[PDB]
Amino acid sequence: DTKEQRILRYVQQHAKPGDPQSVLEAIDTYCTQKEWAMNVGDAKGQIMDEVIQEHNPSLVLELGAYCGYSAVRMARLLSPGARLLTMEKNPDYAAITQQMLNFAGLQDKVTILIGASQDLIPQLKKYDVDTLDLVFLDHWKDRYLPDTILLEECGLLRKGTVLLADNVIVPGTPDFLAYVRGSSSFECTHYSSYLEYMKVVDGLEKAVYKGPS
């Protein structure tokens, strides 16, 4: 029994079925009052709402679904006929996200792609996909810059495509920022958001020297 399962089960018994707003409130409730989890959360969600509303995407690509909070957040704002693709490499997370979408009634607007972004991005041109309107980057931070470059190399960006990148300060994505900011191919805006708490996996490496080669 995983935390992600506990989040899903809470949603299923407290949110209104078929009601995306209700689902987001249930997750945000659970994760502020019971068990913190790595969703963008409501504060950042409101920035995301405005970006979607300002830029009016018909085709959205999300990198990193987890339990589907951000996927519900964006897909509930999309017009009929619009599509959200979300790449998730963890099959168990993909399964939770599908349940979350099904409960919220968004399964028709969203397609989960199980796999790593770096492998799936070059396959997109075989999903009836020409170019993307908006990309939400919220997966492994080491991938922001290469996936962005990959997206460009695969011809998936059009003039006006919006990249929205989370966590560019904490833990931080300095390489990505210097690239898009320094590049004449990208017009960049920054949006501050206060972050009450976050936990990430880290580690130490111990390397014992055994002598030279």
Ligand X SMILES: Nc1ncnc2c1ncn2[C@@H]1O[C@H](CSCC[C@H](N)C(=O)O)[C@@H](O)[C@H]1O
- Residues forming the active site: 138, 141, 166-167, 196
Q: Which of 4, 7, 39, 141 binds ligand X (CB under 6 A)?
A: 39
Q: What is the DSSP letter of 16?
A: P
Two tokens at 84? 């959200």
Apex CA 11: angle with CA 7 and CA 14, to 5°? Answer: 130
Q: Find which of Ca ion, ligand X, none residue 70 binds, CB within 5 to 8 Å per kind.
A: ligand X
Among 87, 60, 69, residue whose Cα is nearest residue 32: 69
Q: Which of 23, 166, 168, 173 binds Ca ion (CB under 5 A)?
A: 166
99 versus 167: smaller Cβ distance to Ca ion: 167
Among 43, 98, 99, 53, residue whose Cα is nearest residue 74: 53
* Position 36 contacts ligand X (CB under 6 A): no
* Position 57 contacts ligand X (CB under 6 A): no
How far apart are the C-alpha atoms of 176 and 66, rounded to whole Å? 22
How far apart are the C-alpha atoms of 182 and 160, rounded to whole Å? 17
Q: Which of 138, 156, 164, 165 binds Ca ion (CB under 5 A)?
A: 138
The residues that touch ligand X, with contacts defined as CB under 6 A, are: 38-40, 63-66, 69-70, 87-90, 93, 116-118, 138-140, 143
